């Protein structure tokens, strides 16, 4: 609709990373979700759920690490993606017991009933991750 600039709710930090204020209304989510659908290379893998953030990650697990395509949506939903591959390796648990910390700039935890799941974050945006889990959570959780 003109004069609508649904890009206004949507901040970039890098060609494969952004987040999405939340406060937009039903009918903005609908046109959200379309320029998802039309244009987001994730959007297979999220269940046509709306992406409220994403970017890549370097999951821990072992000695070592692989990195993923880490997708915060509406649900919520916190989903990993194989990048290279493009196929979907799994999603973190949601409940009211999952909690996100930041360990600094380049590490953030997500820590859930049976398992705490460690990521970095080379970009140094850590805390934005957790910040914005955060926001996600008191709005699920809360009234
Ligand atoms: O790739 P390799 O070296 O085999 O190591 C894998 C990857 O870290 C998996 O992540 P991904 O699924 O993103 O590929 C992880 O599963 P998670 O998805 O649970 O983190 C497996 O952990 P286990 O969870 O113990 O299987 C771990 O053994
Ligand atoms: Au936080």
Redesign the pocket.
């Given at each position: 609709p003109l004069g609508s600039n649904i890009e206004q709710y949507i901040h970039d930090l890098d060609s494969n990373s952004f987040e999405l204020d939340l406060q937009f209304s039903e009918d903005e989510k609908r046109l959200l979700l379309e320029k998802q659908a039309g244009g987001n290379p994730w959007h297979q893998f999220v269940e046509n759920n709306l992406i409220l953030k994403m970017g890549p990650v370097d999951?821990r697990?072992?000695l070592?690490?692989?990195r993923?395509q880490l997708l915060l949506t509406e649900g919520p939903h916190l989903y990993?993606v194989?990048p290279v591959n493009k196929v979907l390796?799994?999603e973190i648990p949601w409940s009211q017991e999952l909690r996100p910390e930041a360990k600094n700039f380049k590490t953030f935890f997500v820590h859930t009933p049976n398992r705490t799941?460690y990521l970095m974050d080379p970009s140094g945006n850590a805390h934005k991750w957790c910040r914005k889990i955060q926001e996600v959570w008191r709005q699920r959780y809360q009234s």
């Open positions: 999951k697990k072992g070592f690490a692989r993923r990993y194989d390796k799994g799941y």
